[PDB]
Design a protein around this motif. Sequence first.
Motif, short mmCIF file in Angstrom:
data_model
loop_
_atom_site.label_atom_id
_atom_site.label_comp_id
_atom_site.label_asym_id
_atom_site.label_seq_id
_atom_site.Cartn_x
_atom_site.Cartn_y
_atom_site.Cartn_z
N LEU A 166 0.83 -1.19 0.00
CA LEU A 166 0.00 0.00 0.00
C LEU A 166 0.87 1.25 0.00
N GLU A 167 2.02 1.23 0.69
CA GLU A 167 2.95 2.35 0.72
C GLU A 167 3.70 2.51 -0.62
N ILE A 168 3.91 1.40 -1.36
CA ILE A 168 4.52 1.48 -2.69
C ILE A 168 3.51 2.18 -3.61
N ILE A 169 2.25 1.74 -3.57
CA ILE A 169 1.17 2.31 -4.35
C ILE A 169 0.99 3.80 -4.03
N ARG A 170 1.04 4.17 -2.74
CA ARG A 170 0.86 5.57 -2.34
C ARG A 170 1.92 6.46 -2.93
N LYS A 171 3.20 6.15 -2.64
CA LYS A 171 4.33 6.93 -3.12
C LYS A 171 4.34 7.01 -4.64
N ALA A 172 3.99 5.91 -5.32
CA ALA A 172 3.99 5.88 -6.78
C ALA A 172 2.90 6.76 -7.36
N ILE A 173 1.69 6.74 -6.77
CA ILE A 173 0.59 7.55 -7.29
C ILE A 173 0.87 9.04 -7.03
N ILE A 174 1.49 9.39 -5.89
CA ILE A 174 1.85 10.78 -5.63
C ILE A 174 2.92 11.26 -6.62
N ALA A 175 3.88 10.36 -6.99
CA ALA A 175 4.97 10.66 -7.93
C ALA A 175 4.47 11.10 -9.30
N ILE A 209 11.51 4.70 -8.45
CA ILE A 209 10.13 4.31 -8.73
C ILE A 209 9.28 5.53 -9.18
N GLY A 210 9.54 6.68 -8.58
CA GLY A 210 8.87 7.91 -8.98
C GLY A 210 9.20 8.30 -10.40
N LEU A 211 10.46 8.09 -10.80
CA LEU A 211 10.88 8.41 -12.17
C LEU A 211 10.29 7.44 -13.16
N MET A 212 10.20 6.16 -12.78
CA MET A 212 9.53 5.15 -13.61
C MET A 212 8.05 5.54 -13.82
N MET A 213 7.39 6.06 -12.76
CA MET A 213 6.00 6.52 -12.80
C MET A 213 5.84 7.70 -13.77
N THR A 214 6.75 8.68 -13.76
CA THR A 214 6.67 9.80 -14.72
C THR A 214 6.87 9.29 -16.15
N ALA A 215 7.82 8.38 -16.32
CA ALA A 215 8.11 7.77 -17.61
C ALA A 215 6.90 7.07 -18.19
N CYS A 216 6.15 6.27 -17.37
CA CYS A 216 4.98 5.57 -17.89
C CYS A 216 3.84 6.50 -18.14
N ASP A 217 3.63 7.46 -17.23
CA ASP A 217 2.56 8.43 -17.34
C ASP A 217 2.72 9.26 -18.63
N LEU A 218 3.96 9.60 -19.00
CA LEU A 218 4.20 10.36 -20.23
C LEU A 218 4.49 9.48 -21.44
N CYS A 219 4.33 8.13 -21.36
CA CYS A 219 4.67 7.21 -22.44
C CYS A 219 3.95 7.45 -23.77
#
Length: 313
Positions: A166-175, A209-219
């Motif tokens: 749940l903490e991985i999901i939280r930090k990732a969604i905020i990223a 993980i935050g950078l991976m999240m920006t990368a996928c979001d802007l894919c």
Amino acid sequence: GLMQFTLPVRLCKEIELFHFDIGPFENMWPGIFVYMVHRSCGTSCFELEKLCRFIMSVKKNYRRVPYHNWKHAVTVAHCMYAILQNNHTLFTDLERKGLLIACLCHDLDHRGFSNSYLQKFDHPLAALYSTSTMEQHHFSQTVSILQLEGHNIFSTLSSSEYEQVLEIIRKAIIATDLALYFGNRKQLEEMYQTGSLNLNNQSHRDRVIGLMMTACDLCSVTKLWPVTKLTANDIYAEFWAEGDEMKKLGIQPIPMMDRDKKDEVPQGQLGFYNAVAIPCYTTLTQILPPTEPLLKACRDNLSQWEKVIRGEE
Ligand SMILES: COc1cccc2nc(Cl)c(C)nc12
Ligand SMILES: [Mg+2]
Ligand SMILES: [Zn+2]
């Protein structure tokens, strides 16, 4: 139990590539996601009944907006799958579980407006969450769906493992709050360059993980040019609708959001690739080298946007 999801030959092959498009058939996307979760995590990881119940509830809570819709969720999740498959020996069992779910849930109940519009309109969510307004709402929506009867896909997990996922999901969604991206990429670039970046450090892992999240979001910027070109219409449809809503509040919108300034789009897209996309894929590639096709594909679309300005299309 011995059921495995099987995609048609073309999809089966193409899904492993970073530039894959999930197509126009809505009904195939949940099967596409389940296939991705089985190859990335394993057939065991989730109870197929609970997972399919969770997927339909997540789909149900995504609005019919031009861009930040259910298709965006499954695309952002696919891009994450592509990253995890090319760096499978780098991620924990829990991270593989949480990241595909975080991507699927990352824009839950998105109304099509930015945090700035929410702030300016004085929407209740802006009073409840001062910063990362929507992103805190998306995580809140993810928890609400996880608490529904028969929807807890992390039931098998221990009390401690459940709090970790749940903490991985939280930090990732905020990223996925692009405002935070700038500082995260700057900190990661510096850590990588001074050799201080250690993937055994949890705060460093969080940043990557935050950078991976920006990368996928802007894919959207990493797909073949016809896909990128068409997805840009959806992005700008939302932008212009918010521009119209800023004008209704008596505020002249930024040119990006003004539908009377459609001619400034190729130059604004050029600025976006230079300021945000290229830095994002460059630093990501320095950190996780098999993600190079994202940067390669991104540079190709930057060149295509220059051709647009030059009257070549
Ligand atoms: C000015 O262009 C933008 C501004 C903010 C976010 C954006 N995200 C994407 Cl994926 C694209 C293609 N363009 C963006
Ligand atoms: Mg976001
Ligand atoms: Zn998104």
